[PDB]
mmCIF file of C-alpha atoms in Angstrom:
data_model
loop_
_atom_site.group_PDB
_atom_site.id
_atom_site.type_symbol
_atom_site.label_atom_id
_atom_site.label_comp_id
_atom_site.label_asym_id
_atom_site.label_seq_id
_atom_site.Cartn_x
_atom_site.Cartn_y
_atom_site.Cartn_z
ATOM 1 C CA UNK A 1 -16.288 -15.624 21.800
ATOM 2 C CA UNK A 2 -13.303 -14.921 19.803
ATOM 3 C CA UNK A 3 -9.486 -15.315 19.088
ATOM 4 C CA UNK A 4 -6.884 -12.914 17.674
ATOM 5 C CA UNK A 5 -4.074 -12.885 15.150
ATOM 6 C CA UNK A 6 -3.137 -12.472 11.825
ATOM 7 C CA UNK A 7 -0.368 -12.015 8.971
ATOM 8 C CA UNK A 8 0.996 -9.765 6.140
ATOM 9 C CA UNK A 9 3.547 -8.832 3.467
ATOM 10 C CA UNK A 10 5.434 -5.612 4.784
ATOM 11 C CA UNK A 11 8.087 -4.201 2.360
ATOM 12 C CA UNK A 12 9.177 -0.381 2.443
ATOM 13 C CA UNK A 13 11.402 1.897 0.324
ATOM 14 C CA UNK A 14 14.710 1.188 1.758
ATOM 15 C CA UNK A 15 14.535 -2.663 1.160
ATOM 16 C CA UNK A 16 14.322 -1.531 -2.416
ATOM 17 C CA UNK A 17 16.020 1.880 -2.322
ATOM 18 C CA UNK A 18 19.878 2.173 -3.432
ATOM 19 C CA UNK A 19 21.519 3.845 -0.822
ATOM 20 C CA UNK A 20 24.542 4.659 -2.983
ATOM 21 C CA UNK A 21 23.139 7.900 -4.863
ATOM 22 C CA UNK A 22 24.948 9.503 -7.952
ATOM 23 C CA UNK A 23 24.182 12.908 -6.882
ATOM 24 C CA UNK A 24 25.376 16.516 -7.898
ATOM 25 C CA UNK A 25 26.098 19.122 -4.913
ATOM 26 C CA UNK A 26 26.288 22.840 -5.299
ATOM 27 C CA UNK A 27 29.832 22.450 -4.289
ATOM 28 C CA UNK A 28 30.998 19.866 -7.091
ATOM 29 C CA UNK A 29 33.390 20.738 -9.673
ATOM 30 C CA UNK A 30 33.216 20.425 -13.808
ATOM 31 C CA UNK A 31 35.236 17.237 -13.082
ATOM 32 C CA UNK A 32 32.193 15.992 -11.088
ATOM 33 C CA UNK A 33 30.014 17.004 -13.681
ATOM 34 C CA UNK A 34 31.917 15.348 -16.465
ATOM 35 C CA UNK A 35 32.075 12.225 -14.523
ATOM 36 C CA UNK A 36 28.456 12.119 -13.837
ATOM 37 C CA UNK A 37 27.689 12.268 -17.431
ATOM 38 C CA UNK A 38 30.510 9.775 -18.746
ATOM 39 C CA UNK A 39 29.843 7.286 -16.096
ATOM 40 C CA UNK A 40 26.065 7.061 -15.828
ATOM 41 C CA UNK A 41 23.118 6.956 -18.053
ATOM 42 C CA UNK A 42 20.859 8.930 -15.643
ATOM 43 C CA UNK A 43 18.548 11.378 -17.425
ATOM 44 C CA UNK A 44 18.521 13.471 -14.109
ATOM 45 C CA UNK A 45 20.514 13.561 -10.540
ATOM 46 C CA UNK A 46 19.292 14.845 -7.169
ATOM 47 C CA UNK A 47 20.829 18.428 -6.517
ATOM 48 C CA UNK A 48 22.186 18.185 -2.963
ATOM 49 C CA UNK A 49 23.370 20.972 -0.260
ATOM 50 C CA UNK A 50 26.931 19.273 0.098
ATOM 51 C CA UNK A 51 28.148 15.744 -0.072
ATOM 52 C CA UNK A 52 28.320 15.798 3.625
ATOM 53 C CA UNK A 53 24.871 17.495 4.846
ATOM 54 C CA UNK A 54 22.979 15.840 1.931
ATOM 55 C CA UNK A 55 20.172 18.419 1.918
ATOM 56 C CA UNK A 56 18.013 17.557 -1.064
ATOM 57 C CA UNK A 57 17.430 21.040 -2.878
ATOM 58 C CA UNK A 58 15.968 19.828 -5.987
ATOM 59 C CA UNK A 59 17.377 17.639 -9.027
ATOM 60 C CA UNK A 60 19.006 18.609 -12.357
ATOM 61 C CA UNK A 61 18.576 17.504 -15.676
ATOM 62 C CA UNK A 62 21.206 15.837 -17.857
ATOM 63 C CA UNK A 63 20.540 18.291 -20.444
ATOM 64 C CA UNK A 64 20.755 20.795 -17.988
ATOM 65 C CA UNK A 65 24.150 19.508 -16.630
ATOM 66 C CA UNK A 66 25.424 19.349 -20.502
ATOM 67 C CA UNK A 67 24.541 23.092 -20.760
ATOM 68 C CA UNK A 68 26.535 24.311 -17.938
ATOM 69 C CA UNK A 69 29.401 22.362 -19.146
ATOM 70 C CA UNK A 70 29.139 23.634 -22.691
ATOM 71 C CA UNK A 71 28.396 27.343 -21.511
ATOM 72 C CA UNK A 72 31.901 26.885 -19.543
ATOM 73 C CA UNK A 73 34.060 25.206 -22.018
ATOM 74 C CA UNK A 74 33.231 27.919 -24.619
ATOM 75 C CA UNK A 75 33.275 30.776 -22.171
ATOM 76 C CA UNK A 76 36.787 29.704 -21.475
ATOM 77 C CA UNK A 77 38.417 29.868 -24.917
ATOM 78 C CA UNK A 78 36.669 33.388 -25.259
ATOM 79 C CA UNK A 79 39.513 35.358 -26.232
ATOM 80 C CA UNK A 80 37.833 38.536 -26.453
ATOM 81 C CA UNK A 81 44.198 18.880 -48.025
ATOM 82 C CA UNK A 82 45.336 19.472 -44.544
ATOM 83 C CA UNK A 83 44.881 16.785 -41.482
ATOM 84 C CA UNK A 84 41.367 16.901 -40.276
ATOM 85 C CA UNK A 85 40.580 16.923 -36.458
ATOM 86 C CA UNK A 86 37.531 16.073 -34.621
ATOM 87 C CA UNK A 87 35.866 19.095 -33.042
ATOM 88 C CA UNK A 88 32.451 20.219 -31.627
ATOM 89 C CA UNK A 89 32.407 23.372 -33.814
ATOM 90 C CA UNK A 90 29.255 24.379 -32.393
ATOM 91 C CA UNK A 91 28.150 28.266 -32.548
ATOM 92 C CA UNK A 92 29.525 28.532 -36.251
ATOM 93 C CA UNK A 93 33.019 30.071 -36.002
ATOM 94 C CA UNK A 94 36.237 28.195 -36.554
ATOM 95 C CA UNK A 95 35.919 24.500 -35.051
ATOM 96 C CA UNK A 96 36.568 24.415 -31.572
ATOM 97 C CA UNK A 97 39.015 21.158 -31.442
ATOM 98 C CA UNK A 98 38.480 18.314 -29.135
ATOM 99 C CA UNK A 99 42.105 18.238 -27.893
ATOM 100 C CA UNK A 100 41.335 21.587 -26.517
ATOM 101 C CA UNK A 101 38.342 20.249 -24.696
ATOM 102 C CA UNK A 102 40.574 17.674 -23.371
ATOM 103 C CA UNK A 103 43.083 20.182 -21.912
ATOM 104 C CA UNK A 104 39.817 22.260 -21.022
ATOM 105 C CA UNK A 105 39.122 19.272 -18.420
ATOM 106 C CA UNK A 106 42.568 19.310 -17.571
ATOM 107 C CA UNK A 107 42.635 22.782 -16.274
ATOM 108 C CA UNK A 108 39.397 23.179 -14.755
ATOM 109 C CA UNK A 109 38.635 19.708 -13.664
ATOM 110 C CA UNK A 110 38.511 20.860 -10.179
ATOM 111 C CA UNK A 111 36.864 24.356 -10.580
ATOM 112 C CA UNK A 112 33.825 24.451 -8.414
ATOM 113 C CA UNK A 113 30.696 24.733 -10.772
ATOM 114 C CA UNK A 114 28.563 27.604 -10.799
ATOM 115 C CA UNK A 115 25.001 26.447 -10.891
ATOM 116 C CA UNK A 116 23.488 29.856 -11.441
ATOM 117 C CA UNK A 117 22.506 29.543 -14.986
ATOM 118 C CA UNK A 118 21.300 26.231 -14.600
ATOM 119 C CA UNK A 119 17.786 24.938 -13.778
ATOM 120 C CA UNK A 120 17.100 22.821 -10.562
ATOM 121 C CA UNK A 121 13.773 21.026 -10.426
ATOM 122 C CA UNK A 122 11.523 20.901 -7.419
ATOM 123 C CA UNK A 123 10.015 17.658 -6.544
ATOM 124 C CA UNK A 124 6.283 18.039 -6.175
ATOM 125 C CA UNK A 125 6.374 15.028 -3.290
ATOM 126 C CA UNK A 126 8.047 13.568 -0.365
ATOM 127 C CA UNK A 127 8.980 9.883 -0.150
ATOM 128 C CA UNK A 128 10.151 8.631 3.151
ATOM 129 C CA UNK A 129 11.736 5.339 4.090
ATOM 130 C CA UNK A 130 8.948 4.109 6.342
ATOM 131 C CA UNK A 131 6.761 4.174 3.196
ATOM 132 C CA UNK A 132 4.944 0.966 2.084
ATOM 133 C CA UNK A 133 5.817 -0.525 -1.502
ATOM 134 C CA UNK A 134 2.336 -0.291 -2.165
ATOM 135 C CA UNK A 135 1.986 3.559 -1.507
ATOM 136 C CA UNK A 136 5.298 4.172 -3.099
ATOM 137 C CA UNK A 137 3.978 2.142 -6.349
ATOM 138 C CA UNK A 138 0.685 4.350 -6.038
ATOM 139 C CA UNK A 139 2.685 7.588 -5.952
ATOM 140 C CA UNK A 140 4.760 6.633 -9.192
ATOM 141 C CA UNK A 141 1.775 5.719 -10.931
ATOM 142 C CA UNK A 142 -0.174 8.773 -10.407
ATOM 143 C CA UNK A 143 2.742 11.075 -11.052
ATOM 144 C CA UNK A 144 4.301 8.874 -13.928
ATOM 145 C CA UNK A 145 7.743 8.506 -12.347
ATOM 146 C CA UNK A 146 10.668 6.540 -13.043
ATOM 147 C CA UNK A 147 13.081 7.489 -10.200
ATOM 148 C CA UNK A 148 12.200 9.091 -6.834
ATOM 149 C CA UNK A 149 14.333 10.350 -4.151
ATOM 150 C CA UNK A 150 14.024 8.979 -0.588
ATOM 151 C CA UNK A 151 14.706 11.528 2.009
ATOM 152 C CA UNK A 152 15.210 11.799 5.683
ATOM 153 C CA UNK A 153 14.266 15.345 7.136
ATOM 154 C CA UNK A 154 15.641 16.984 3.825
ATOM 155 C CA UNK A 155 18.542 14.758 3.248
ATOM 156 C CA UNK A 156 18.972 12.471 0.460
ATOM 157 C CA UNK A 157 18.965 8.724 1.590
ATOM 158 C CA UNK A 158 18.441 6.732 -1.600
ATOM 159 C CA UNK A 159 16.857 6.286 -4.912
ATOM 160 C CA UNK A 160 14.163 4.094 -5.894
ATOM 161 C CA UNK A 161 13.094 3.097 -9.634
ATOM 162 C CA UNK A 162 9.902 2.289 -10.557
ATOM 163 C CA UNK A 163 11.603 -0.975 -12.062
ATOM 164 C CA UNK A 164 12.896 -2.158 -8.715
ATOM 165 C CA UNK A 165 9.321 -1.211 -7.269
ATOM 166 C CA UNK A 166 7.502 -3.542 -9.677
ATOM 167 C CA UNK A 167 10.099 -6.622 -9.228
ATOM 168 C CA UNK A 168 9.745 -6.287 -5.485
ATOM 169 C CA UNK A 169 5.920 -6.261 -5.670
ATOM 170 C CA UNK A 170 5.949 -9.252 -7.905
ATOM 171 C CA UNK A 171 8.600 -11.298 -5.706
ATOM 172 C CA UNK B 1 -16.779 22.030 49.903
ATOM 173 C CA UNK B 2 -17.745 23.222 46.460
ATOM 174 C CA UNK B 3 -19.753 25.989 44.728
ATOM 175 C CA UNK B 4 -22.141 26.664 41.842
ATOM 176 C CA UNK B 5 -25.248 28.130 40.447
ATOM 177 C CA UNK B 6 -25.469 28.779 36.943
ATOM 178 C CA UNK B 7 -26.874 28.311 33.282
ATOM 179 C CA UNK B 8 -26.782 28.443 29.671
ATOM 180 C CA UNK B 9 -27.936 30.507 26.658
ATOM 181 C CA UNK B 10 -27.731 29.818 23.018
ATOM 182 C CA UNK B 11 -25.061 26.773 23.254
ATOM 183 C CA UNK B 12 -23.076 25.309 20.632
ATOM 184 C CA UNK B 13 -20.541 22.235 19.842
ATOM 185 C CA UNK B 14 -17.499 23.903 21.288
ATOM 186 C CA UNK B 15 -19.260 25.041 24.516
ATOM 187 C CA UNK B 16 -19.558 21.309 24.840
ATOM 188 C CA UNK B 17 -17.156 19.696 22.755
ATOM 189 C CA UNK B 18 -13.630 18.568 24.426
ATOM 190 C CA UNK B 19 -10.831 20.161 22.669
ATOM 191 C CA UNK B 20 -8.385 17.586 23.851
ATOM 192 C CA UNK B 21 -9.058 14.832 21.509
ATOM 193 C CA UNK B 22 -7.409 11.258 21.839
ATOM 194 C CA UNK B 23 -6.587 10.847 18.158
ATOM 195 C CA UNK B 24 -4.565 8.213 16.126
ATOM 196 C CA UNK B 25 -2.624 9.516 13.451
ATOM 197 C CA UNK B 26 -0.960 7.509 10.227
ATOM 198 C CA UNK B 27 2.334 8.802 11.633
ATOM 199 C CA UNK B 28 1.781 7.162 14.963
ATOM 200 C CA UNK B 29 3.756 4.183 16.409
ATOM 201 C CA UNK B 30 2.800 0.862 18.067
ATOM 202 C CA UNK B 31 3.457 2.539 21.258
ATOM 203 C CA UNK B 32 0.892 5.215 20.354
ATOM 204 C CA UNK B 33 -1.702 2.285 19.825
ATOM 205 C CA UNK B 34 -0.946 0.545 23.139
ATOM 206 C CA UNK B 35 -1.110 3.746 24.826
ATOM 207 C CA UNK B 36 -4.502 4.517 23.197
ATOM 208 C CA UNK B 37 -5.940 1.023 24.319
ATOM 209 C CA UNK B 38 -4.503 0.878 27.937
ATOM 210 C CA UNK B 39 -5.152 4.594 29.052
ATOM 211 C CA UNK B 40 -8.842 5.237 27.320
ATOM 212 C CA UNK B 41 -12.109 2.881 27.215
ATOM 213 C CA UNK B 42 -13.123 4.426 24.121
ATOM 214 C CA UNK B 43 -14.339 2.206 21.516
ATOM 215 C CA UNK B 44 -13.055 4.310 18.528
ATOM 216 C CA UNK B 45 -10.701 6.992 17.742
ATOM 217 C CA UNK B 46 -10.555 9.773 14.903
ATOM 218 C CA UNK B 47 -7.931 8.590 12.474
ATOM 219 C CA UNK B 48 -5.964 11.885 11.505
ATOM 220 C CA UNK B 49 -3.759 13.104 8.947
ATOM 221 C CA UNK B 50 -0.851 14.179 11.244
ATOM 222 C CA UNK B 51 -0.954 15.293 14.589
ATOM 223 C CA UNK B 52 -0.120 18.664 13.171
ATOM 224 C CA UNK B 53 -2.060 19.257 10.147
ATOM 225 C CA UNK B 54 -5.157 17.077 11.649
ATOM 226 C CA UNK B 55 -6.836 15.962 8.637
ATOM 227 C CA UNK B 56 -9.858 13.681 9.662
ATOM 228 C CA UNK B 57 -9.290 10.960 7.370
ATOM 229 C CA UNK B 58 -11.810 8.911 9.299
ATOM 230 C CA UNK B 59 -12.180 6.889 12.407
ATOM 231 C CA UNK B 60 -10.457 3.412 13.744
ATOM 232 C CA UNK B 61 -12.430 0.744 15.756
ATOM 233 C CA UNK B 62 -10.873 -0.455 18.918
ATOM 234 C CA UNK B 63 -11.162 -3.697 17.860
ATOM 235 C CA UNK B 64 -9.523 -2.647 14.482
ATOM 236 C CA UNK B 65 -6.588 -1.045 16.784
ATOM 237 C CA UNK B 66 -6.280 -4.242 18.676
ATOM 238 C CA UNK B 67 -5.877 -6.094 15.401
ATOM 239 C CA UNK B 68 -3.016 -4.034 14.028
ATOM 240 C CA UNK B 69 -1.215 -4.685 17.044
ATOM 241 C CA UNK B 70 -2.025 -8.173 17.367
ATOM 242 C CA UNK B 71 -0.877 -8.787 13.523
ATOM 243 C CA UNK B 72 2.506 -7.047 14.372
ATOM 244 C CA UNK B 73 3.355 -9.008 17.554
ATOM 245 C CA UNK B 74 2.879 -12.262 15.907
ATOM 246 C CA UNK B 75 4.363 -11.404 12.548
ATOM 247 C CA UNK B 76 7.726 -10.597 14.439
ATOM 248 C CA UNK B 77 8.247 -14.025 16.452
ATOM 249 C CA UNK B 78 9.211 -14.992 12.804
ATOM 250 C CA UNK B 79 6.584 -16.581 10.692
ATOM 251 C CA UNK B 80 3.816 -18.605 11.184
ATOM 252 C CA UNK B 81 0.117 -18.860 12.657
ATOM 253 C CA UNK B 82 -1.282 -20.688 15.563
ATOM 254 C CA UNK B 83 -0.168 -19.594 18.930
ATOM 255 C CA UNK B 84 -2.006 -17.641 21.905
ATOM 256 C CA UNK B 85 -0.525 -15.241 24.054
ATOM 257 C CA UNK B 86 0.060 -16.278 27.769
ATOM 258 C CA UNK B 87 1.111 -15.907 31.129
ATOM 259 C CA UNK B 88 4.147 -18.364 31.194
ATOM 260 C CA UNK B 89 4.685 -21.497 33.238
ATOM 261 C CA UNK B 90 0.811 -25.138 25.554
ATOM 262 C CA UNK B 91 4.020 -24.666 23.442
ATOM 263 C CA UNK B 92 4.585 -22.197 20.556
ATOM 264 C CA UNK B 93 2.692 -19.394 22.229
ATOM 265 C CA UNK B 94 3.695 -15.806 22.430
ATOM 266 C CA UNK B 95 4.481 -15.552 26.184
ATOM 267 C CA UNK B 96 3.601 -12.485 27.773
ATOM 268 C CA UNK B 97 7.012 -11.694 28.589
ATOM 269 C CA UNK B 98 7.947 -11.709 24.832
ATOM 270 C CA UNK B 99 5.050 -9.243 24.246
ATOM 271 C CA UNK B 100 6.751 -6.876 26.693
ATOM 272 C CA UNK B 101 10.053 -7.138 25.189
ATOM 273 C CA UNK B 102 8.206 -6.578 21.988
ATOM 274 C CA UNK B 103 7.008 -3.255 22.851
ATOM 275 C CA UNK B 104 10.380 -2.379 24.092
ATOM 276 C CA UNK B 105 11.745 -2.831 20.921
ATOM 277 C CA UNK B 106 8.974 -1.840 18.463
ATOM 278 C CA UNK B 107 7.572 0.795 20.772
ATOM 279 C CA UNK B 108 8.554 3.800 18.402
ATOM 280 C CA UNK B 109 8.088 1.919 15.055
ATOM 281 C CA UNK B 110 5.601 3.891 12.975
ATOM 282 C CA UNK B 111 2.248 1.893 12.314
ATOM 283 C CA UNK B 112 0.988 0.603 8.786
ATOM 284 C CA UNK B 113 -2.656 1.286 8.606
ATOM 285 C CA UNK B 114 -2.883 -0.715 5.544
ATOM 286 C CA UNK B 115 -4.528 -3.813 6.749
ATOM 287 C CA UNK B 116 -6.536 -1.646 9.034
ATOM 288 C CA UNK B 117 -10.166 -0.629 8.438
ATOM 289 C CA UNK B 118 -10.852 3.014 8.728
ATOM 290 C CA UNK B 119 -14.313 4.474 8.638
ATOM 291 C CA UNK B 120 -15.716 7.390 6.551
ATOM 292 C CA UNK B 121 -17.962 9.356 8.592
ATOM 293 C CA UNK B 122 -21.530 10.060 6.806
ATOM 294 C CA UNK B 123 -21.795 13.851 8.212
ATOM 295 C CA UNK B 124 -19.809 16.812 8.835
ATOM 296 C CA UNK B 125 -20.342 18.668 12.354
ATOM 297 C CA UNK B 126 -18.926 22.175 12.633
ATOM 298 C CA UNK B 127 -18.664 24.547 15.307
ATOM 299 C CA UNK B 128 -21.274 27.026 14.359
ATOM 300 C CA UNK B 129 -23.709 24.229 15.003
ATOM 301 C CA UNK B 130 -26.504 24.772 17.524
ATOM 302 C CA UNK B 131 -27.192 22.371 20.136
ATOM 303 C CA UNK B 132 -30.522 21.503 18.661
ATOM 304 C CA UNK B 133 -29.176 20.601 15.264
ATOM 305 C CA UNK B 134 -26.358 18.701 16.889
ATOM 306 C CA UNK B 135 -28.918 16.756 19.029
ATOM 307 C CA UNK B 136 -30.932 15.926 15.990
ATOM 308 C CA UNK B 137 -27.992 14.983 14.089
ATOM 309 C CA UNK B 138 -27.129 12.329 16.793
ATOM 310 C CA UNK B 139 -30.716 11.275 17.194
ATOM 311 C CA UNK B 140 -31.422 10.405 13.423
ATOM 312 C CA UNK B 141 -27.968 8.769 12.987
ATOM 313 C CA UNK B 142 -27.924 7.240 16.266
ATOM 314 C CA UNK B 143 -24.601 8.387 17.436
ATOM 315 C CA UNK B 144 -22.738 8.653 20.972
ATOM 316 C CA UNK B 145 -19.528 10.671 19.759
ATOM 317 C CA UNK B 146 -19.204 12.795 17.184
ATOM 318 C CA UNK B 147 -16.136 14.582 15.475
ATOM 319 C CA UNK B 148 -16.217 18.422 15.115
ATOM 320 C CA UNK B 149 -14.182 19.634 12.062
ATOM 321 C CA UNK B 150 -12.913 22.827 10.603
ATOM 322 C CA UNK B 151 -12.425 22.601 7.060
ATOM 323 C CA UNK B 152 -11.388 18.983 7.252
ATOM 324 C CA UNK B 153 -9.386 19.723 10.340
ATOM 325 C CA UNK B 154 -9.980 17.668 13.712
ATOM 326 C CA UNK B 155 -11.197 20.510 16.318
ATOM 327 C CA UNK B 156 -12.905 18.168 19.016
ATOM 328 C CA UNK B 157 -15.261 15.718 20.169
ATOM 329 C CA UNK B 158 -18.805 15.793 21.479
ATOM 330 C CA UNK B 159 -20.477 13.044 23.281
ATOM 331 C CA UNK B 160 -24.293 12.430 23.453
ATOM 332 C CA UNK B 161 -24.309 12.685 27.161
ATOM 333 C CA UNK B 162 -22.469 15.795 27.238
ATOM 334 C CA UNK B 163 -25.249 17.123 24.666
ATOM 335 C CA UNK B 164 -28.151 16.139 26.672
ATOM 336 C CA UNK B 165 -26.898 17.349 29.729
ATOM 337 C CA UNK B 166 -26.324 20.691 28.005
ATOM 338 C CA UNK B 167 -29.578 20.638 26.798
ATOM 339 C CA UNK B 168 -31.059 20.353 30.167
ATOM 340 C CA UNK B 169 -28.754 22.388 32.087
#
C-alpha cells in the first residue's frame, strides 16, 4: 500500500537568459562595430546570420573586431614647436591623426563590413532554453565559460552569464 | 485457417529481438510518458539519448515514470503538498478533470529526468550473440528483458519468453 506525490525546484536557461543580445551580423556596418566596442565591455559577441533570421554562425572576439576596424581605417587613407595632436600613429610612418579617424567613421559609418579577414569562432556546444540550471552550470564548469549563447534550432535567443547562473542557483 | 511447419538453426539475438522498441528519451515530453504508461504493460523502458541517436543511457522503471508525472502534475497546481487525485463529486484534492486539463496543457513539455532514477545495465548484449549465450546471460542475472545494443545504440529488445521458445522451436 502506497501513495503518490512530490515536489521540486525547476529553473531553466530562459528564466535567467538575457533576451536582448548585443550581436554582430554579417550584414552589419563599421558603425555597428564601433558601437559594439564603445557601448559594451564584452570580450566577444555572437556572430549572426542577419539581425532578422538570427542564425548563430559563431562568435567574434573583441580583439578580432578591433582588428577589422583597424585594417579598414588604415586601408582607407592608403594613398598609394607646433601644435600637437592626438593620434594613433601605428605602423610607424607619420601620425595618422585622430581627427582623421573621426572623419573616417563619418564617411564609412554605414558601409557593410567585410568579415573575411576576421576570425569567427565555433562553439563546441549547444545550449537550449529547456535546459536546467544545473546542467547549464555543469556545462559552464566543465568548459570554463563566462557567457553562453542559448539557441533555438540555429537561431540566437539569448545570453546566459555564469554570474547570473550562480546567483540564480543560490536564490 | 492458418499454416506453418518450420524450424531454426544457429539462432541469434536479432532473429528473436524485437526491433521496434518503446523507449523513453531525454527529449521526450509528458505526453510521451503518459503514452508509454497507458498503452504498454512494461515494467521498465530503455532510457535513450535522443530518439534519433539512440544512445542507451540506462533504463527507467515504470514506478519511476509514474513519479515524474506525479511530481509534475502536483507541482503545477501552484505550490503545496497533501492532496490525492480523485473522481470529483475531501478538499484540496487534484480532481481528475484538472489532470485531464493538465495533460492538455503540458502534453508537449519536454520532461526533466533529473529527479528521476535511471538504472545502469551491468551487461552488454550484442546482435552477434548466440541464443545459448544470451540464455545463460539471462539465467545468471535473472533477467526478463534485455536491450540489444550496437556500440551504445539501442537496437532492440529480447524477452526471456522469446528466448526459451526460440530454444525449443
